Design a protein around this ligand. Structure first.
Ligand SMILES: OC[C@H]1O[C@@H]2O[C@H]3[C@H](O)[C@@H](O)[C@@H](O[C@H]4[C@H](O)[C@@H](O)[C@@H](O[C@H]5[C@H](O)[C@@H](O)[C@@H](O[C@H]6[C@H](O)[C@@H](O)[C@@H](O[C@H]7[C@H](O)[C@@H](O)[C@@H](O[C@H]8[C@H](O)[C@@H](O)[C@@H](O[C@H]1[C@H](O)[C@H]2O)O[C@@H]8CO)O[C@@H]7CO)O[C@@H]6CO)O[C@@H]5CO)O[C@@H]4CO)O[C@@H]3CO
Ligand SMILES: Cc1ccc(Oc2nc3nc(-c4ccc(-c5ccccc5O)cc4)c(Cl)cc3[nH]2)cc1C(=O)O
Ligand SMILES: Nc1ncnc2c1ncn2[C@@H]1O[C@H](COP(=O)(O)O)[C@@H](O)[C@H]1O
Ligand SMILES: Nc1ncnc2c1ncn2[C@@H]1O[C@H](COP(=O)(O)O)[C@@H](O)[C@H]1O
Lengths: 443, 295, 193
């Protein structure tokens, strides 16, 4: 009578991740197999990962993708947390590249289409799996990609850049190895490009013995292009593995590519059933619209299960509004629009980010402090360059909050950034009044 | 059940009309009125709401109508500079010219269309109650374009396929118009007198050749030709001559469904009507169509 | 089809089916046994052996229960985990279970382990600017066919960041993108100095 949880008997260890160990889960009554990730509560509490573990549980339950490890149930005990999730018999992709060698152009395409579909699904739900590698990517008996180990994934916050860096020197974008600030999606595409090179060639595009020369190869962005792979797939790998994050390919760029378009199934990138795609909820705002019009919130909860009756008709109407692109969004490069204004006679003016300075960074900090002390400002110094200024409006009587961060453009060039923090008077206007009052005082 | 056009509104909120990504301009009452009209040209926006720093809330709405109103009142001649336009601020002229007229995004479409008809305005801004800031500036063109999107799935009734002669939509009598030799100052006076968005440029025989709308006035500020209003309306519309696919005109023997489909495709506000041969005939605007859709 | 799948997840209501307890100990001893207050110290529960770790699952009720391990015929308690002194003499390891729900438990776990509204000067290299901010949505030109007030979909990072144009005249120009209700709005401000 071996170790049992919830009708499930624990067996052989699959492996050990960044946090906890995964052990094979076998049903006693039926014989169904699950992967049980055992996270020791004491080891989670010993570090500040308690917040990262909470988000990882919430995100895995929120996801509903056929190419992502499905989380069944999170069993909690006083000593440790148990995560009962989808088991895949085929094993890791890294072992398949070593055993079977380089996968055929058509077969490797199918696996790349499935892996990118899961990466695209994560980006839609504002989650970025920073540790993408064939070790973290698993396969089943029917040979289908499944992404696991979300312990290194982080949320996509509006007006925030994540500088945290993953351990693996390979599969990490040039901005990651340099330790510079970046946005989440660009790294996942670079991580997908190196994976695309892995099953097509068999080896890594940037590989070296010692760490310093390896970093020089990634920053250079020069990789070997073999003779066997065609002209179409070669152009994709070059566009996917770019040094510049803006010049690099995006989720829309790969979907529009000729090599990727072929052998692509219909269920991979849906447009109409994208609203029901997320398991977790109907839009929270959406529920209220139905609550403010007819019934109190939490109404028809049984009804939603029942299907008797209403909110689904409002969600289906949102899909029709999202279908027409020309009405809700503008396209950047045809007959001229009647509301288009002719150019003014005196050159087009060009917008720029905040205010720039050429003086020492220590001098700019002393300059922003003396300007803030002149007005009635109250803040909290987080970092030697990061400030969270708060000013109370005298007319409305409401508190207005905004962020300040110092950056550098070139060797002798410096920049100051103004960010708005959401809480009678307009919030968007009050942030502008708070900004103008500091820019006018400073020089 | 009989009125399917009314059911499209009321049930649908104002939020659905607001695009995913938009451009909005806000002017502080303390800046010069001449610099504000020159700012609308550089940004390409037709209208922009006004903000008061002392009151800490939106007071007015700056439109091209204000630029029309200034000129009739203050223009002296082509020789004498309009000393008022340059010196006047947004707040100073606001005290001379005549509550905030706006709508909520949570509020119904039926309550938004009624606000444009009752207050007799073309541009109505939408302000969030929880946030306090402006989101979008609603227009008659945007409401009908939103209707043409949802009405395709619904079957149109008998009155939707009715001719212009049988229907009562559009002001058939006392139509104000300009001629090919009529100066800009005389044309601008009609915009303040009769209070209409479009003025049709009609030949001495009775043939419609061009159309001078409130938007065509912004060209005087764009080219800085506002100092000479003595010149004819043909000279004021000489800029579009190279890139213009003729004036939009429909017939009296045309169905309401065809008339609505013509306005959304052309993206124009007022639609000229002529019979048999080009001739003066009552003009039908979006304000007539939207009023008929409500009642 | 999709609606049905979404519906199925919705039907489920969060709950935990079983409430067990881990009870583990790491040693090099072949025979391991554990006795506590749940079985009233009458029987010795056998530990299943992981190659290194030893663990035995037992559905214990909520409350304070004192247990002691017995390795190779020697009753020795676990040092690493908290222990309480018994009336007999020996200080046995105490296991106290109250809540075993993941969301609540995390918060309690979360609870375990600079100054509010305090303006003060700080004493004693800046981070490199991301190139995603350099590209401005207002600098980008759209099609001649589409509406002028309409703009393309902006990157999430860009919004809430203030963008200002150099002042030709006394008047000052500054704008920022904000998101409302999953809607994006780029508000411009004209105000003289
Ligand atoms: O058997 C139950 C018991 O099992 C475990 O205890 C083991 C322990 O882990 C081992 O280390 C070892 O303990 C030895 C110990 O080191 C020695 O000291 C000796 O103890 C003797 C005392 O030195 C001596 O003073 C006297 O003790 C008196 C007690 O102080 C006094 O309280 C009373 O004893 C009775 C208690 O009053 C009463 O509360 C009740 O106690 C029970 C506990 O409540 C219950 O948890 C359980 O204890 C476990 C223990 O948790 C395990 O770790 O059973 C207890 C007994 O029923 O009943 C007590 C009955 O004595 O009176 C005595 C004096 O008469 O005598 C004791 C020895 O009798 O003992 C070990 C010598 O190697 O082995 C023990 C094995 O129990
Ligand atoms: C990295 C790590 C993670 C978790 C951890 O704590 C736990 N180890 C655990 N082992 C087990 C466990 C118990 C029995 C078995 C087992 C034994 C025999 C046959 C089959 C089995 O599954 C395997 C693992 C359980 Cl259920 C919970 C655990 N909690 C300890 C460590 C650690 O080594 O520091
Ligand atoms: N050129 C015109 N002359 C006279 N009346 C008009 C003209 N154009 C529109 N109208 C009418 O004036 C009202 C408002 O017009 P508009 O400002 O174009 O919405 C509508 O009821 C129209 O029927
Ligand atoms: N019936 C029409 N035919 C041709 N052009 C028009 C017509 N109505 C409006 N316009 C033009 O469309 C632009 C915007 O019109 P409005 O929406 O009426 O301000 C102006 O430049 C007008 O010259």
């Amino acid at each position: 009578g071996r170790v049992k949880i919830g009708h499930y008997v624990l067996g052989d260890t699959l492996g050990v991740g960044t946090f906890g160990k995964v052990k094979i889960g076998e049903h006693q009554l039926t014989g169904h197999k699950v992967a049980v990730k055992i996270l020791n509560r004491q080891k989670i509490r010993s570090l500040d990962v308690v917040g990262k573990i909470k988000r990882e549980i919430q995100n895995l339950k929120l996801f509903r993708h056929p190419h992502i490890i499905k989380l069944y149930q999170v069993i909690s005990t006083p000593t440790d947390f148990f995560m009962v999730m989808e088991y895949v018999s085929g094993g890791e992709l890294f072992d398949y590249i070593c055993k079977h060698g380089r996968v055929e152009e058509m077969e490797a395409r199918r696996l790349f289409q499935q892996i990118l579909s899961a990466v695209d699904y994560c980006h839609r739900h504002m989650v970025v799996h920073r540790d993408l590698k064939p070790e973290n990517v698993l396969l089943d008996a029917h040979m289908n990609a499944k992404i696991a180990d979300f312990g290194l994934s982080n949320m996509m916050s509006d007006g925030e850049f994540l500088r945290t860096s993953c351990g693996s020197p390979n599969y990490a974008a040039p901005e990651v190895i340099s330790g510079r600030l970046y946005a989440g999606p660009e790294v996942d595409i670079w991580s997908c490009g190196v994976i695309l090179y892995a099953l097509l060639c068999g080896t890594l595009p940037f590989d070296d013995e010692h760490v310093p020369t390896l970093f020089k190869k990634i920053r250079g962005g020069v990789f070997y292009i073999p003779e066997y792979l065609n002209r179409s797939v070669a152009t994709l790998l070059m566009h996917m593995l770019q040094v510049d994050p803006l010049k690099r390919a995006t989720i829309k760029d790969i979907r529009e590519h000729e090599w990727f378009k072929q052998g692509l199934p219909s269920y991979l990138f849906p447009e109409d059933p994208s609203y029901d795609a997320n398991v977790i909820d109907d839009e929270a705002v959406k529920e209220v619209c139905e609550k403010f019009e007819c019934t109190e919130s939490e109404v028809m909860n049984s009804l939603y299960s029942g299907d008797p009756q209403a909110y689904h008709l409002i969600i289906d109407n949102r899909r029709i509004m999202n279908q027409a692109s020309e009405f809700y969004l503008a396209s950047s490069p045809l007959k001229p629009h009647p509301e288009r204004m002719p150019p003014l006679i005196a050159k087009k003016a060009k917008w720029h980010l905040g205010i720039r300075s050429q003086s020492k960074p220590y001098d700019i900090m002393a300059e922003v402090y003396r300007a803030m002390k002149q007005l009635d400002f109250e803040w909290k110094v987080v970092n030697a360059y990061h400030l969270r200024v708060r000013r109370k409006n005298p007319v409305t009587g409401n508190y207005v909050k905004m962020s300040l961060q110092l950056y550098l453009v070139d060797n002798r060039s410096y920049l100051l950034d103004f960010k708005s923090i959401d809480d009678l008077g307009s919030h968007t206007m009050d942030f502008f009044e708070m900004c103008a009052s500091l820019i006018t005082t400073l020089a | 059940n009989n009125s399917v056009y009314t059911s499209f509104m009321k049930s649908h909120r104002c939020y659905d009309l607001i695009p995913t990504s938009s451009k909005l301009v806000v002017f502080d009452t303390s800046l010069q009125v001449k610099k504000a009209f020159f700012a609308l040209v550089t940004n390409g926006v037709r209208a922009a709401p006004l903000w008061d720093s002392k009151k800490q809330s939106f007071v007015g709405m700056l439109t091209i109508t204000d630029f029309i109103n200034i000129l009739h009142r203050y223009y002296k001649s082509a020789l004498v500079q309009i000393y008022e336009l340059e010196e006047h601020k947004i707040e100073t002229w606001r005290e001379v010219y005549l509550p905030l007229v706006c709508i909520s995004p949570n509020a119904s479409l039926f309550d938004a269309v009624s606000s444009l008809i009752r207050n007799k305005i073309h541009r109505l801004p939408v302000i969030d109650p929880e946030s306090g800031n402006t989101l979008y500036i609603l227009t008659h063109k945007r409401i009908l374009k939103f209707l043409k999107l949802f009405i395709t799935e619904f079957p149109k009734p008998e009155f939707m396929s009715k001719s212009l002669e049988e229907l009562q939509i559009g002001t058939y009598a006392n139509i104000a118009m300009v001629r090919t030799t009529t100066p800009v100052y005389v044309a601008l006076g009609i915009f303040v007198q009769h209070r209409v968005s479009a003025l049709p440029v009609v030949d001495e025989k009775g043939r419609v050749v061009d159309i001078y709308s409130k938007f065509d006035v912004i060209n005087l500020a764009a080219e800085k030709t506002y100092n000479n209003l003595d010149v004819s309306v043909t000279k004021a519309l000489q800029h579009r001559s190279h890139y213009f696919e003729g004036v939009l005109k429909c017939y009296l023997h045309e169905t309401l469904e065809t008339i609505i489909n013509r306005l959304v495709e052309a993206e124009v506000h007022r639609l000229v009507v002529v019979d048999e041969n080009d001739v003066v005939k009552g003009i039908v605007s979006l304000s007539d169509i939207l009023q008929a859709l409500v009642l | 089809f999709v609606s049905w799948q979404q519906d199925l997840e919705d039907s489920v209501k969060p709950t935990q089916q079983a409430r067990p307890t881990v009870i583990r100990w790491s040693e090099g001893g072949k025979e391991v046994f554990i006795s506590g207050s749940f079985n009233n110290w009458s029987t010795k529960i056998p530990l299943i052996k992981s190659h290194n770790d030893f663990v035995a699952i037992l559905d214990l009720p909520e409350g304070e229960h004192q247990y002691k391990f017995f390795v190779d015929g020697q009753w020795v308690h676990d040092p690493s985990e908290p222990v309480v002194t018994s009336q007999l003499g020996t200080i046995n390891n105490l296991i106290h279970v109250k809540k075993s729900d993941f969301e609540v438990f995390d918060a309690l776990k979360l609870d375990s382990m600079g100054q509010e509204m305090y303006a003060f000067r700080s004493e004693e290299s800046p981070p490199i600017l991301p190139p995603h901010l350099l590209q401005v949505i207002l600098n980008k030109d759209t099609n001649i066919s589409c509406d002028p007030a309409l703009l393309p979909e902006p990157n999430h990072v860009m919004l809430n960041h203030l963008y200002a144009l150099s002042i030709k005249d006394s008047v000052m120009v500054l704008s920022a993108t904000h998101r409302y209700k999953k809607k994006y709005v780029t508000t411009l401000l004209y105000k003289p100095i």
